């Protein structure tokens, strides 16, 4: 009678809201039960489960990932090309992450990356949003001079600075394809310390390495600790994705939250990075395909999607959803969503990303400029060969 399906979740920040939508689905479909699964190291466990052959019915997988690309070709995921609900996805966002000209992922939302800032304290200290690298250098120094902590960096979570270093190369080269040309599709051992592009990368990275730029006990600070630190007003800024604001809002800040994109060398060269945030795939070997499809179809509904957006905040590709204006806290970060200024994660054409997080954070810890170059070459050479 009643059949149970599973939804593998990687959106830890939205657990409470996604479970609320699930119950709303369960109340409308009494013959269907859905288990929302949240596990630590969800990326590794999903790899484990896909190999083991215990693929969850509905899977939150990021559509730019090589995992999605490889598994879709293998036939792990159901083809969703001829589904009616795929027409509810505007901006041709479903077709963007097509594999063999076939859609295997429904990306509901698009995540972005930038800098969160405390509007109140910024006004209090009379500081403006930077528009160049040099202005971003000056802002950090001026916060230090005022006796405040500019950045809250999570030293124990290297992934938090993934978007930062990816935008460091992006603003240095011009975009995503330009960044992958220097790092990924270049010759083996092409990345040199003398390269102006690498000199630019270091310069952008050195902004996090200004004297007194980071909070006390940052080396062993987690993602949760930095959210709390920013919410209390211990730090004025924190670099993170658009996925963080729901957890920041949770902590009840005593200030209005603002965002801005990482600037380029000159004005009007700022970029953002991201892909499908809330992005769902259906297992091809699911025992209950009708029930699983209905669950995905449910999330494509505008009044259901409004429930998610009003909490999350990331731009949605779903039609009929009233999105927040330019007064929104995520505005400065997510303004250029679905434009040329928003480039896909660079690990769309990599084999992994874990080591890129390491070498990014290692530099913030050490400052070894040659060491970072060595790490970059050591990371990208296996992909070229
Ligand atoms: O830049 C980091 C990350 O961005 C994209 O994934 C967005 C995703 O990141 C975070 O999720 C975690 C850490 O909390 O990261 C892994 C996935 O990489 C998950 O196991 C875990 O939940 C945020 O907490 C999420 O809200 C957000 O959805 C991109 O897809 C990744 O490749 C990676 O570059």
For domain 1-112+276-330, the question of CATH label 3.40.190.10 is answered with: yes
Q: Is 8 in the pocket of ligand 1 (CB under 6 A)?
A: no
Q: Is 159 in the pocket of ligand 1 (CB under 6 A)?
A: yes
Q: Is 160 in the pocket of ligand 1 (CB under 6 A)?
A: no
Measured from the Cα of 166, ligand 1's closest atom is: 1
Q: Is 11 in the pocket of ligand 1 (CB under 6 A)?
A: yes
Longest CA pairwise span in the chain (Å): 68
Sheet with 149-151, strands from edge to edge, namely 149-151, 235-241, 113-118, 257-260
User: How determined?
Assistant: X-ray
Measured from the Cα of 113, ligand 1's closest atom is: 1
- Site to substitute for ligand 1 among 16, 241, 245, most atoms within 8 A of C-beta: 241
User: How far is Cα 278 from Cα 108, in angstroms, rounded to an integer?
Assistant: 5
Measured from the Cα of 10, ligand 1's closest atom is: 22
- CATH 3.40.190.10 positions along the chain are 1-112+276-330, 113-275+331-385
Q: Is 111 in the pocket of ligand 1 (CB under 6 A)?
A: yes
Whose CA is closest to atom 34 on ligand 1? Answer: 162
Nearest Cα residue to 278 out of 250, 315, 248, 252: 315
Resolution in A: 2.7
Displacement of CA 283 from its chain's centroid (Å): 23
Burial class (CB in 10 A: 0-12, 13-18, 19+), 154: buried
The distance in angstroms from the start CA to the end CA of the chain is: 53
Provide the 10 A C-beta neighbour count for residue 52: 8
Beta bridge partners of 281: 59
Measured from the Cα of 41, ligand 1's closest atom is: 20
Q: What are phi and psi of 224, to 5 degrees?
A: -70, -35
Going by DSSP bridges, is the β-strand pair 113-118/342-343 parallel, antiparallel, or unpaired? unpaired
| C-alpha distances in Å from residue 26, one per residue of 4, 31, 153, 301 | 11, 8, 40, 15
Whose CA is closest to atom 31 on ligand 1? Answer: 62
User: CATH number of the domain at 113-275+331-385, out of 3.40.50.150, 1.10.3720.10, 3.40.50.11540, 3.40.190.10?
Assistant: 3.40.190.10
Q: Is 114 in the pocket of ligand 1 (CB under 6 A)?
A: no
Whose CA is closest to atom 3 on ligand 1? Answer: 159
User: How far is Cα 44 from Cα 193, in angstroms, rounded to an integer?
Assistant: 33
Instruction: Report residue 62 as tokens.
Output: 């990021």
């Amino acid at each position: 009678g009643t059949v149970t399906i599973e939804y593998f979740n990687q959106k830890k920040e939205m657990t409470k809201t996604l479970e609320e939508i699930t119950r709303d689905f369960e109340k409308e479909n009494p013959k269907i039960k859905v288990k929302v699964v949240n596990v630590p190291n969800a990326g590794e466990v999903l790899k484990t489960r896909v190999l083991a052959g215990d693929v969850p019915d509905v899977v939150n997988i990021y559509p730019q990932s090589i995992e999605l690309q490889e598994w879709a070709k293998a036939g792990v995921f159901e083809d969703l090309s001829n589904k009616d609900y795929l027409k509810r996805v505007k901006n041709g966002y479903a077709e963007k992450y097509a594999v063999n000209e076939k859609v295997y992922n429904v990306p509901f939302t698009a995540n972005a990356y930038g800098i969160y800032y405390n509007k109140d304290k910024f006004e209090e200290l009379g500081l403006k949003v930077p528009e160049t690298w040099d202005e971003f250098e000056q802002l950090v120094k001026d916060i230090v001079a005022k006796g405040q902590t500019p950045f809250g960096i999570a030293g124990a979570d290297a992934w938090t600075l993934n978007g930062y270093n990816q935008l460091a190369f992006a603003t240095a080269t011009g975009g995503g394809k330009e960044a992958n040309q220097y790092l990924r599709y270049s010759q083996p051992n092409a990345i040199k310390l003398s390269d102006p592009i690498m000199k630019d990368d270091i310069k952008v990275m050195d902004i996090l390495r200004i004297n007194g730029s980071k909070q006390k006990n940052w080396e062993g600070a987690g993602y949760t600790d930095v959210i709390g630190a920013f919410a209390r007003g211990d730090v004025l800024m924190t670099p993170n994705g658009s996925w963080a604001i729901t957890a920041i809002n949770e902590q009840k800040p005593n200030f209005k939250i603002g965002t801005f994109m990482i600037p380029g060398k000159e004005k009007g060269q700022s970029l953002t990075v991201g892909a499908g945030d809330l992005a769902w795939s259906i297992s091809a070997t699911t025992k209950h395909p009708k029930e699983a499809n209905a669950f995905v179809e449910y999330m494509t509904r505008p009044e259901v999607m409004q429930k998610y957006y009003d909490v999350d905040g990331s731009p949605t590709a779903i039609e009929g959803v009233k999105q927040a204006g330019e007064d929104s806290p995520l505005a400065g970060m997510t303004e250029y969503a679905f434009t040329d200024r928003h480039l896909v994660w660079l690990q769309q054409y990599w084999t992994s990303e874990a080591d890129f997080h390491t070498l990014t954070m290692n530099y913030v810890l050490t400052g070894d400029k040659q060491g970072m170059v060595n790490d970059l070459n050591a990371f990208f050479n296996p992909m070229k060969a």
